Structures are given as C-alpha cells and as structure tokens.
Amino acid sequence: PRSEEDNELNLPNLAAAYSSILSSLGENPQRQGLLKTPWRAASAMQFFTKGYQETISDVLNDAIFDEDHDEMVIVKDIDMFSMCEHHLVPFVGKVHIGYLPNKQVLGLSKLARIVEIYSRRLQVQERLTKQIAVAITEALRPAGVGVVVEATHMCMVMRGNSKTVTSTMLGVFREDPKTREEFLTLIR
Amino acid sequence: PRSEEDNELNLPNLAAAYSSILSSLGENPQRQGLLKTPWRAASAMQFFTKGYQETISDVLNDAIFDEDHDEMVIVKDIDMFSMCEHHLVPFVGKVHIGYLPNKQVLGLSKLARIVEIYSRRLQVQERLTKQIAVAITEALRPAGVGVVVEATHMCMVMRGNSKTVTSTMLGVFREDPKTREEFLTLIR
Amino acid sequence: RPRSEEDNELNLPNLAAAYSSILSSLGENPQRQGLLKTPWRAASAMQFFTKGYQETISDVLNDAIFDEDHDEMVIVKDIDMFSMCEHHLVPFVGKVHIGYLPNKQVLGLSKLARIVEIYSRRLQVQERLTKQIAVAITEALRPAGVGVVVEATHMCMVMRGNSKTVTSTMLGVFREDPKTREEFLTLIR
Amino acid sequence: PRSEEDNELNLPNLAAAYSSILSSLGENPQRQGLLKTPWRAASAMQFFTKGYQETISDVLNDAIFDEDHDEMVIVKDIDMFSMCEHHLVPFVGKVHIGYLPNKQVLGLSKLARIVEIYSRRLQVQERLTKQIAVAITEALRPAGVGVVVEATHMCMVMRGNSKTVTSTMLGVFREDPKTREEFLTLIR
Amino acid sequence: RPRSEEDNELNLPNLAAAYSSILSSLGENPQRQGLLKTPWRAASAMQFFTKGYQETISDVDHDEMVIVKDIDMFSMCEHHLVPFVGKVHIGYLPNKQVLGLSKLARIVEIYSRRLQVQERLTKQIAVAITEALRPAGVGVVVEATHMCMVMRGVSKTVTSTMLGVFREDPKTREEFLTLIR
Amino acid sequence: PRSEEDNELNLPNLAAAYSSILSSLGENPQRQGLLKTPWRAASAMQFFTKGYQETISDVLNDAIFDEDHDEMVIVKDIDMFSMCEHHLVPFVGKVHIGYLPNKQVLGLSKLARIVEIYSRRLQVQERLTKQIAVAITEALRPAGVGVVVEATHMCMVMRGNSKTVTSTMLGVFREDPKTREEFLTLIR
Amino acid sequence: RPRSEEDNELNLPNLAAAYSSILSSLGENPQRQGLLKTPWRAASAMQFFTKGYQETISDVDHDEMVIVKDIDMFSMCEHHLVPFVGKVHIGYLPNKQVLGLSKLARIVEIYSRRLQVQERLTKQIAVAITEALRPAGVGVVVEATHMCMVMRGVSKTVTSTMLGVFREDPKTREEFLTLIR
Amino acid sequence: PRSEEDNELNLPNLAAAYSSILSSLGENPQRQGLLKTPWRAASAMQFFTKGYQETISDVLNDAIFDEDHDEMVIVKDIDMFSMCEHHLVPFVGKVHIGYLPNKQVLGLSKLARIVEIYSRRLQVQERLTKQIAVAITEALRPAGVGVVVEATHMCMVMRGNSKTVTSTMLGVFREDPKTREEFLTLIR
Amino acid sequence: RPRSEEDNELNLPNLAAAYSSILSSLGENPQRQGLLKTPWRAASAMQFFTKGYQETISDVLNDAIFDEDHDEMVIVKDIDMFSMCEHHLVPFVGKVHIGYLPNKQVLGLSKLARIVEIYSRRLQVQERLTKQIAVAITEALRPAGVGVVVEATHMCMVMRGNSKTVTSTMLGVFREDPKTREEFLTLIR
Amino acid sequence: PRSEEDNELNLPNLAAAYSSILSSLGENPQRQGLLKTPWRAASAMQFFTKGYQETISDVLNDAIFDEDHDEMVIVKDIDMFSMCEHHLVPFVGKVHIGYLPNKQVLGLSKLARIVEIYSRRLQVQERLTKQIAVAITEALRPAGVGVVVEATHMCMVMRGNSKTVTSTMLGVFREDPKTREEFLTLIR
Ligand SMILES: [Zn+2]
Ligand SMILES: [Zn+2]
Ligand SMILES: [Zn+2]
Ligand SMILES: [Zn+2]
Ligand SMILES: [Zn+2]
Ligand SMILES: [Zn+2]
Ligand SMILES: [Zn+2]
Ligand SMILES: [Zn+2]
Ligand SMILES: [Zn+2]
Ligand SMILES: [Zn+2]
C-alpha cells in the first residue's frame, strides 16, 4: 500500500503537474488564488486517493460474536465520496449495506471504514460496490450481504441531475428473493 | 480570449500532466480505465474552463426594448457549474438573477449565457456573483440588479453538506430595501 | 377586428401547407404513418394556442359586481397559465397570482381567469402578458391598486439545458405602499 | 444522417414557412417581437431535431469491460426533452435505464448520448422508449435491459398535469419478474 | 325571522319537484335506479348546505393576541350554486373579553352554510367577533377553492378583513399573517 | 346524444327550476347577487353534464395508431371532475389508465377525451371507472386494461377530507397479478 | 335497548356531580371562573363522545374493488377514558351489492363514538359491512394515535381486519394495502 | 402544592367518581375491559394534573447561569401536553420560548420544567402562555421574553384539525417590533 | 436482583468522583463555574440513561388483556427509543416498530412501550435490544408471530462524520410466512 | 493546548475512571460487550474534546484578499457536533455563518475549521456561538458577522425533539437591521 514517505516524495511531482495544467489552461500561475493552487490541488488529490494507503486486512480486527442473533443488520445512508477513474472528476453519494450474520457481527464504525478504504481511490461505481460486499463477506462469513450505492457523477452533471444506482447481492441476498425484498424495503 | 487552435495545441500538454498525476498517485496509467484517462481528464478540464474562450462583448447583442415596463424581472434557479480556483475541485449550484429595467430587457437565453461565460472558469463564488451582476449592469443600464448564487463546494463536502450563498446588489437593489425584500421573497 | 372562426377555417390549409414544408425542410418524410395528419394537427394546435386573438377584453368585461363596503384585499393565486414564446414559438407554462384592493367594484373569479386566458393564448413575452393582465383589471374595476405576479417555465431554454421566470407588475397602492405589497407577496406563498 | 450543410441550406426554407405561419395566425410579422422570429423558430426547431444529424453506430464505439460483475446497473432521472410527432409540441420528462451486464458496461456519458440522439427527433414516447432499450442491447449484449420514460406532454397540458409512463423490458428484465421488481423499486 | 324546521318540512317537496324537473331538463331519465331518490336527496343536501339561515348570531391581565387557524370552511357560491371549500384563520387582540374556541367555530358555520360571496363571508365573521368581544382588533383570512372554476379547468382565492388595531397597526398585522402560516 | 338545440331550448326550464330552488331555500331571488343566478346555475349544470352531448363511438376515428409494441402504456393523473348522481354535488379527482396493447395504440388526447365524455355526467365513481375501461377495451382490443379513479366526494366533505378509490381490471390486468402489481406501482 | 335522549337528560346531573367530585379530588377549586360550568360541560362532552351507544347498526356487472380511505375517526379508550384519534381505511369486493359512502361513514361513527379498544372498533366495522352487503371480502385498517400514551411521552397504532377474499387471496390483500397508501 | 399523600388519599375518591361516570354513560362497569378503568382513569387524571404538585419557586435554584451575553436565546418545539379546564379534554402542541438575557441565562432542562409545571394542570392556552412568560421574567429579569404556544384542542377536533396559536410578548419583545420579527422568524 | 434507589444513592458519589477525574484527565479545570456541578449532573444523567437495570420484565407483565376472536395483526409503530452504546458510552436514538399476530392474548399499548423502555435504558447493542423486545413479547403473549424493527442514529459514528442503523427480529409466523412479513413491513411505512 | 503526549499519558486515567463508572452503574465490566469499553469510551471522549489540542491563531494564517467586494458571504448548514459541559452528553446541529467583508474573505475550509476547534470541546451553545463569531471577526476584520446555531441537546431529547437556537450578531449585522433581515432570510 501507499505510505506517508511516498506522499511526501510525490507531492512536488503532483504540484509540478498541476502548475503545468494551470499554464496549459490559459491562466497565470503567479496570480492571487493560483499561487498555492499547485500544492493545494496536489494535497486534495492525495486525500481523495488515501484509500490506497490502507489495507482491508489491518482494518479487519473487529468481528464481535452474537448470542442467538440470526437477524438482518442494515446500515443505510453511509456518506460516500469517490473519484471517477475515467475523467478524474468526483462522484458523491450514499452506501446502504445489509447482512444476515453467522455468529459474527461487524462494528458500525468498521463498516463505514470499509466504505472509506475503497471509495477514496480512482474508481468505477460498479467496482466500489462489489469491493464493499466482498470485504464484508470475507470479514464475517455471513449467510448473505447486500450493498447498494447511489451516487451523483459530476463528470456528466457538469455536462448538463441523474443518480446512478449499483447493487451487489451475495449469498442469501441473491438466492432468497424474500430476503432481498426485505433489504430493499428497509433501505427506503 | 482562448481559441480552438490553443485548445488543440495544449491538449497533449494537459494529457502529459494528467498521466504524471496518475503515476504520482500510485496507479499504473497502462491499465483498464486509466489508458484514455490523461486525454479524457484534459478534455474535461478544457470544457470546464471553456468560458475563457468567450467574451461578454460578442455575446451581448440582445437588449430588446420594452413598452412602458418599469417592473422587476427575475430568472431564478439557473443551473451553474464552476471550478474552485484554490483546489481545482468543482462547485455546483444555482444563480438567481433579478433586475429593474430602464427601457431595455435582456433575453432569457442571453442571461443564462452570462452565467455560463463566467462560471466555466477557475473561480471564487464571490467573483462569479459580482461578474454576473456587472455584465448585466453594463448590458442593460438598468435601475438595479440583484444576483444570488447558492453552491455546494466539493472541496469541503469531500472533506466531511453545506451550501455557500453569495449576493451582489447593485443600483436600486442595494439602495431601496423594499425592492431588495421583494427580490429575496420572489426567489424563494 | 379580432380573429374569427371564418378566418380560422380559411387559414387552416395555409398553416397545414407551411407545416408540411417544415417537415420536409427538417429532413423528415411527411408521407410516413405518424406524420400524415401532422400538418393539420400542428396547424389546429397552433390555432388553439393563439385563440386569445379571437377574444376582446372589452366584450368579456360585462359583470363588475357591486361589492361595496369592501375596502379589503382580494387575491386569486395559482391561476394556471399556458402561453407561446413569441421569439421561438415554443410554449411557456406557469401560474398567475392576481391581487387587488377594490374601490366599491369587484370582479368575478371566472372573469379574472378569462383575462388571463385572453392574453396568454397569444404569441407573448412574459413581461407583456403580466402588464396586460394588470392593466385590464385596472381599467375594469378602477381599484386602489392591483398586483400581478407571473411565474413560468420557458421551454425555449428548458429544452436547451431549467429555470422559473418571475415577472411582477404593481399598480396604484400596490406600487406606492410597500406595506400593501409585502402583504400581497406573503399571501401568494 | 442530417449534416451542417443541410441545416445551412434548409434554414431559409424553415424561416419562409415560419413567416407564413405568423401571417396565417393573424399576426403582423413586422412587429418588434416577431421580426427575427422566422429565423429563431427555424433554428429552435433544428436544435429540437438535431438527433437526426447523429448516428448511433459512430457514438457506440466505447464500451468499458468489467469481469465478475453480474450485478444490476441503473441510471435514473436522466432529463429528456422531445418533440411530439403528431402535433409538433414538446414533451419533457425523465428516462430511467437499468441493465444486467455480460462482462460489458457502458459509460454514463454514453448512456446519456443514447437518450439525446433518440429524444432530439419527432417522436412517439413508445418509440423513444424502445429505441433507447435497443441501442443499449446492441452496444453491450447484456443479460437484460429496462427503460422507463415519464414525460409531460404539452399537447394535453396546454389543453387543460398528467404524466405518461412507457416501459420497455428486454432479456432477463422481461422474463425474470424478480429482476423487474428490483429495477422498478430502485428507480423510485 | 330565521329559517325553521317547519319550513324545511314544507319546502322539501317543492325542492324535490324542482330537482325532478332539472334531471329531465338535463336529458336524464329520472326513473333509472341511481336517479330515483335523487330529487329528495339533492333537496335535503341543499337544505343542509344552507342551514346557516336557520341560525342567528345573536343566539351564539390576559390581553395577548389569540389566533385560531385552519378552521375548515364549506360554503355555496351564490352566483352558480356550486360549492367552495377552504379554511378560515381568525385572530384577535382582546379587551378583557375572549371567546370560546367552539363559539368561534360556530360563527364560521352560521355564515358559511349559506349562498355566499367569499368577500362577504370574511367580513361577516370579522364583524360578528367585533360585536361579540369589543376587542382592540380582529383579523379574518379566508382561503378557498371555488368549484365553479376548478370544474371549468382551473386553485385558491384569499380574502382578508382587518379591523381595529389589525387594520391600523401594521406591526400587529405582520405578526398575525406570520403566525397563520 | 344531447344537442346544442336541446341546450338552447332547456336553458329557460333549468333557470325556472333554479329560481324556484332559491325561493324554496328562503332566499330573495331579486337581490343583486341572485338576479342572474337561475341562468348561471343552469349554464353551469349544462357544462357539468356536457358529456351527454358526446358519443364514445364518434371518438375512435382518426385516433387509433399502430405500434407493434407489447409493452405497458400508462397515463396517470388525468384530472377528472364529475357530478354525484345521488345528491347532485361534485366529486373531483384523478384517473390513472394503463394498458398492454395488441398491435393497436391510442392517442393520449383521445384517452383524455374518454375520461371527459363519461365524467361530465350524473355519475357513480364505480360506473365511471368501468365505462372508461370498457371504452378502451372496445377501442383497442388489448391484452389488458386497468383503470384507477381516486376522487374526493363533496357530498360527504361538505358534511365533515376522505378519498374514494375504485379500480377496474380487465384482461391480463385482472388475471396476471404480476402485471397488476407493476401497474399499481407505476401509478404512484 | 340503545341509549336515548331521555337517558341523556336524566343522567346529565349525575355526570355533572361526578365531575364536580373529580375537580375537588384533583386539588382544584370548582368555584373559580374557568371551572364553574366545567361539571356540566365535561358531562355533555362525555355524552357526545359516547353517542354511538344511542345508535343501532340495524337502522343504518359492477363488481370491482371499492375503497374509502382516510375516514376521520375519533374514539375513547375504554381502559383510561382518554381519546384516541385516527383514520379508517375500508375496502371491499362487492357481490351485486354496494354501500353508499355516507352509510360507510355512519358505520365508523356508530362504533367509534363509544368506550373502545382499537382492535374491537376495527372488527365491528368489518363485520357490519359483511352483514350489510354479503360481499366477496372486506378489509378494514385503522391507524390511530392514543392520547393515553402520547400524553405520557410517546405515534401510531395500526390494526387490520381481513374477511372473505381479503383474508384468503393474498393478491387481493396486496392490492388493498397498496391502494390505501 | 399537591403531595403524594394527597394522591394516595384521593385515588379511591377519583375511582369512585369514574365508576359512577361509567354507569351514568350506560356502560356495564363489571365487564372485563372496564373492571380496572375507574382506577386507570383516576391514575391517568392524577398524572395529567401532576403540575399542581410542583412549585415554580422550587425550580429556580441550581438552574440560573451567568453568561455575559446580550444575544437572543430560543428554545423551540417544546412538546406540551395539557388538559382543557372547560371540558376536561386534552390539548396538545408545542411551546416556543425566546428571550434576551440581562447577564443571567437559564438551563435548557429548567425551561422545559417550567412548561411541564404549568401545562400539567386544568388550563386555558392563554393562561399557560402567560404563566410561562411570567415565570421566565421573574427568574431571569431579562430585556425581553416571548412565548408562543400552538396546540390542537381535542374538545373541538373530536367534534369535527384546527391549531390554536397564543403568544405573550414581554419587555423588548413587546416594545421593539424588529426583535419580535426576528423571534417569530427563527421559531419557523 | 435489579438495581434499587438505595444502590443509586450509594453509588452517586462514586460516579461523581469518576466524572471529576475525567474532567481533569481531559485537560479541563473542574473548579470553573460551568463544571462545578458537572460530576454530579453527569452521574445523575448516566443513572437515568441506565434506569432500565432497576426494572424487571416479569414485574411489568401483569395485564395481558383477553381480546379473543382477534386473529388479526396488531402494530405499534414509531415508539421513541433512546439508548446507550455499550462500546463507547455514547447515545443512540431512534424508533421501534412492533407487530404481532395474537393467539387470544393481546398486550396493552402502555405495556408494549414499557418493554421498550426497560431494555433501551441500559448499555446496549441495537441487535440485542431488538431481540430482547421481541422475546419479551413472545414470552408475554405466546402469539402466532412477532416482528420488531429498530431504526436508530448512532452518535458514536454521527459525531465521527451520519447513517441510520436498522435491525429486525422476526419470530413465529413473521419469520416463516413471507406474506405476513411483507404486510408488516408495508404497514410500518 | 492539549498534545498527543498528553492524550497518551491520560488515556489509562480515563480508562480507569470509565471502568469505575461501569461498576458504579451496576454492570459487569468483564462481559464481552464491556471488556474494551473503558478504553473505547476514553478514546471517544478524547476525540469529542480534540478542539482543546488546536489553537485558533495557528489555523488563522490563510485569509484570501478580494477588492471591490462589499457583498455578503454566507456558509449555511455546517454540521456541528459538540459536548454539553453540564452533563457530558452530546448536542448536535448546524452552524450558519454570514459576513460582510472589508477587502478580506476567509476560505470555506478555514470557516469549517473554526466551527470544529470550538465545537469539539465541553461547551454551552451560547459560548460556542460567540466563539465562532469572534474567531471570524479576528481573522478578517469585517464590516459585520452573524452566527446562528441550531442544535438538538441530547440532555432533553433522552429525557422526552426541541431545537435550541442561539444567534450572535456583530458589527453591521448587529447595528443595521436591514442587513440582519437579509442574513436570516438567506439562511432559510
Ligand atoms: Zn467520469
Ligand atoms: Zn476549494
Ligand atoms: Zn423563447
Ligand atoms: Zn401530441
Ligand atoms: Zn360561482
Ligand atoms: Zn353523493
Ligand atoms: Zn388508554
Ligand atoms: Zn374545551
Ligand atoms: Zn459505539
Ligand atoms: Zn445539558
């Protein structure tokens, strides 16, 4: 994964590229709000991709056991902020996670941490959705997991708004349609 | 102003800077969705700053005369999409324009064209608001003009949403408070 | 003279002929199933959208009911309005909010709606339609004041990529007394 | 397809017909507001039918490939503006697209260009709905596609608002009712 | 004298006879199942809609503004005999005399259940409260949907009567109009 | 059907009956506000029952189109204004029509004319709902048709508000419950 | 036999006497201005809230599902004598017999204006409709806010009675529950 | 004030009166649902009037803070549940309190206890509003205080819904209209 | 044994002592005006937030009203719930939706609310609070089935940067019959 | 200010006190769910009061300069999460900031950092409101500043929701009532 040493070393390279963009756009990088912009844009881009620094394995250290709880757990409206890999323009929305545990439940804070690791990268919504559902499956080994991501893509909102919904259903969520209906009803 | 010849000439320079950013972020620019990204991001950035190509003077050729109309004209909820100059991150919202004419009214399409010229640039919301109000004042010479811009800045929404409202009041809109009250009530 | 049904009957084939020419000039086949009756359908639709030319404001004015001892503000809000943009021939639809302070003369609700219909069903500019409604009421009732607010969505710019246009005409006490104007704008919300 | 040479050549024909329409309606085409109307209404009509200039095959040449993703992708609330072919009066609304890919996904911007090519023509809502569904099927070869179009027809809004809903279901969207239920729930 | 139950009994066959004539004049068959009891049902409905004629208003340091908003109102248009329904918002500044909430609602019912003009219904309620309490001021706002124009293709008519301090002090009027929202 | 000759001949009869009603209610028909009421009420009642003048048979010509579409078409929120046949008091609301065509479609304006023909009469909501559904079935011969009418009855709103919903399901709408579920979901 | 106006006249002083005792037992002064007429006013209000006892239900190819939703309901909790207000949604599939809208509302009024349990009020209305029309099925849904627990710090209690085809056919029940939304 | 000893002693008296009410209404007090009702109603009525047990004077200690703030403090949407003194029927709603302090502030919990003391009694909304405003004035000696109570009276909602708004303005709230406007705007 | 008022009186100074230590460990001055009574105020607030320990589910169960001939679903939705996160000692507030199909035994509305209060006023995990409410109702009424849905906002993650947590326990016919479960989830909306 | 060395040193003290609180409340600190709670509640409390670690002077070193802009800037709906200093229970809401600059504007991210430094401390809403207003005044030296804070206090939400509104007006916001009216209208 990416490190703080890498970030320190690559910051002047990113600032050099951002200053070249300011020049190529027909702007004077030696003006009022454009003086510190090569560095500010570089630091913003490093923050938007800080998920590369994290590994899902080290975060996973919280699979708390449940006593006789064979019931569906849902965490809806988790704020998600990601970067489109095709155009390098943000896409912002919400993630709705649902699962049927098998003696192990994940902490609420840790569920939102999985969303953060994957969303803070150059992404495609379809991949971010599957990554979140696969991490949960591998962390808890549940009966099933359902992930629904609804986001507004700026790369087409700035072009002339429409929401993109992607859903990954695994285990009992994809096989039992009565379980899937319950999940989709409860996330409303 | 910027030209299509300039855009053709600077596109490979922008693509060279975007590919360097992909490399500096810890990504392989020779992969699936990252192959055409240096060019796609460069073309998106040229589109987001296409207002530099336009001049407010050539657009201004539509000051249609009015017969005995000394009444307030408002065009509210004009979609506005701009780029923050400090971080190079979008900021998206609406512009509400209002004016009291002096024998000359501007076409609705031309009012939204003023918003487009100024918004499609590296901006500060405060400047974009004043630029829109000054262009209208210089185009129509009215009794007064009021511009209210409400936008969501991604450079702070991606950091953890809050709307930023900036308002420029000129002429009778800044002097007569009864006129200003009417405008702010009608834009709701 | 206003437009008549005899004029409409006589000009319908001329409008259909022009619409058939438009279909061809746009690169369409006017002989295809869906376009066969279109020159006539578009012509009849355009005649309906401009039927306000057939009406006269003076002849609609016939019953100004004498509700004397009424020195209080009357408002008719959310009157549906459908008009045609005179610059591009594209619709613009919205609502008209009318308000007035009578001078021992009130106008019937149906007659206020007929004023909106006469002026809106024409090739218009929102600013003119607003003033025309306001002036018609002033001339019909001779009130203390009248306020007209028109909020409409112009398709000629919504089809180009979405913004309400608000125009307001204040006459008499509505124009002069700001406390009267504040009451009107609050009540139309 | 229609070209810019065709548009330049047919503009005076359209302006001549529009001038005739102003006269046939009982208007004075020499009055201030109507002077440039034959040309303005001609250029507006050319813009409303600019989809004739575009070809679907040339636009559909950029389909992204994603493996192990047999999950439903939805793009809802896509703004749509079309022309009624029976009366030449607009009909505006939203398009909701949904599909189950077969190792091939379409870019969000390209989905919006399919809606634009077909909607910017003299249409019937039923045809526009099928055209979009077919364009997606041809571009991706997916398991199934669903298109729902909700529009307000100015023909029966200017006559005294009622929404018209048309839906085209293809492949697994048509056959599996559990897939169709999920799509219709998610577009709400 | 106000209308009585003796008059309602005596005039019911007259109203039923007129409604029988209306069904025929409209091109309907008054002998069909759904129209058989209609001359009597319409007559009794019209008597109920105008039952306010039977009633008489004469029968029906804590000085702070009192407001009773969203009082349901159902009246009949006197020009076309078509209903108009809405809400009444009443406000007043007392002078050591307040009115019961049920009695304020009875004033609205007495005047609304008659052949009306919205402007008159608004003034009649404001005058009744002024005469009952002798307050510093009273404000009445009526917002109604007239079916005689909604059935013709079109939403709300607002009429307001301001008396006393409500009419004179604009700061009092602003407070009232803000609070009824 | 009723004619304009009949309306001219019966207007004084209706005015005579309305004048008698004013007297029977204890009003003075000579007062300013009631003088023209016998004629105004008579003309209003003739307008509310103008559907008697129209014939359903004279509406099918130059209305039925040919689609080649087996997909569901819905026209929701059609404003409906009718008169209660029991008390002669209005009942106003919305009609939602849906159908699965069989190589025959119906123009949107003609669907609205079916609602107007039947609603502008002395009605019972149950009958108005069935009459619309039968008219569409006879005009198009479709796979199925569904009609839902939701109206507020003034004859009980004036007595102390409550919406009445009546639904007629024919063909595949009546038999296939999965089709009926889709229709009822889409009209929301 | 049902309650009569003779019983309302005879029992009013008994109820007023009991309400006089309640004011004193609560620690109030029944002679203060606001409480003077309260023993009689509370007694008459309680008689009105239970006026359904006076009424008797026995007195009060177009076979498609008919629904009357959002019928206003105002009842009294029989456990604590505290009101509970809400809405009744009625639905039925007729068998060549339909009921007038006003008569459906009168069924709700007869049973709601009594000392009730929501579960019973729901079943009584469903049974009355079944006995009046003999339909294919009937569905009654009552959603009410109980003041006896809202005044204690807490929003809606939903009770549903499904009879005939509404109980048996789940596709019919789904349609009804969808349409009442 | 009323005590727990008084409540214990008067509970059988209230139960006796409630049993008499059940009989006077034509009910059988021996039926299952009514058996414990004389005691349940008695305990409910004692709870609804528990404000008699409290004293306003015993609430000011360990409650008044010292701020050095001359800015307006507002506590809106305080749930209020009271009993009509004319009919013994509840009236429920919200209290909105506002004040301009004079070097003396009041704890949020103690403001809510003032509302509870006065509301839990046989009341008239006008009195409850003034009693709260006077209690705050006497506790803090502020520049001004404003109390707005909006409640639904069941004694008229059960008769056929309508909100009653009462407002008491004291000090600068009564005198300065610009202060009163700010308060009424902020409580919305 | 459950917690008592004698226990609360005895442990209040111990809780106040611990809270005073927390103020110091956080870098605050416990002698400043606003913090003087805080060790006692926080201690009393924490005792109130955990007052459910003082209650017993068996003793609250005393009136299972015999509403026989009721083979229909009873729902009590939007019951306000306020609880304490056992992991971080931070509140989590929301609503509880309860539903059940009785077997000639119904529970009073007030008693259903008392079950929610007993379990919620403790150091909890939403999953446990949901199952505890469900099991208490099953044991009190022996019904055909019971459904409990709890939707709450956890401050321990809203204060960290905003998401509702929904937990549902389905027992008996609610768990087995999917048509019953669909009806319950539709009616709680 | 507080440091990371202080946090490391005081964590076992806080954990020891939290372990004592679990015992004093009648809980078994050895049960699964409570085992790591002394440390988790200690770290949560340290996060809720991390504003003590920050200094306002070090953050306020980046104020942008804009000339000829004497127009009002507003940042509304800034999420705020604070701790009640009387009971140590959270209070969450929104901050609405407004100001009239004097050739000096503050970055949107820096306005949000002022809210964070002061809100992440044991507070009283009245103080937090004044602190933010003062921090802006000191950083920009503007014509005037307005701060409105709306929060829900868990002290009186867990006890039986009412919002608390506090407003601090400085400079022209305090003196000119027409400026104050505009600000309060725009934050709605
Ligand atoms: Zn993109
Ligand atoms: Zn920025
Ligand atoms: Zn135009
Ligand atoms: Zn058409
Ligand atoms: Zn009328
Ligand atoms: Zn009727
Ligand atoms: Zn009760
Ligand atoms: Zn009362
Ligand atoms: Zn936690
Ligand atoms: Zn507190």
Residue numbers in the entry:
A (entry chain D), B (entry chain D), D (entry chain E), F (entry chain A), H (entry chain A), J (entry chain E): 58 to 217, 222 to 249
C (entry chain C), I (entry chain C): 57 to 217, 222 to 249
E (entry chain B), G (entry chain B): 57 to 116, 125 to 218, 223 to 249
Extract from the study:
The effects of GFRP on GCH1 occur via formation of heteromeric protein complexes between GCH1 and GFRP, which are dependent on the intracellular concentrations of the effector molecules phenylalanine or BH4.
We determined structures of the human GCH1 in the absence (xtal_GCH1) and presence (xtal_GCH1+active) of the substrate analog 7-deaza-GTP and in the presence of the allosteric inhibitor cpd-1 (xtal_GCH1+allosteric and xtal_GCH1+allosteric). Xtal_GCH1 is a redetermination of the previously determined apo-hGCH1 structure. This degree of flexibility in region A, which could possibly serve as a lid for the active site, could be essential to allow substrate association. Region B consisting of residues 213 to 222 is only weakly defined in the electron densities in all structures without an active site ligand bound (xtal_GCH1, EM_GCH1+hGFRP+allosteric, and xtal_GCH1+allosteric).
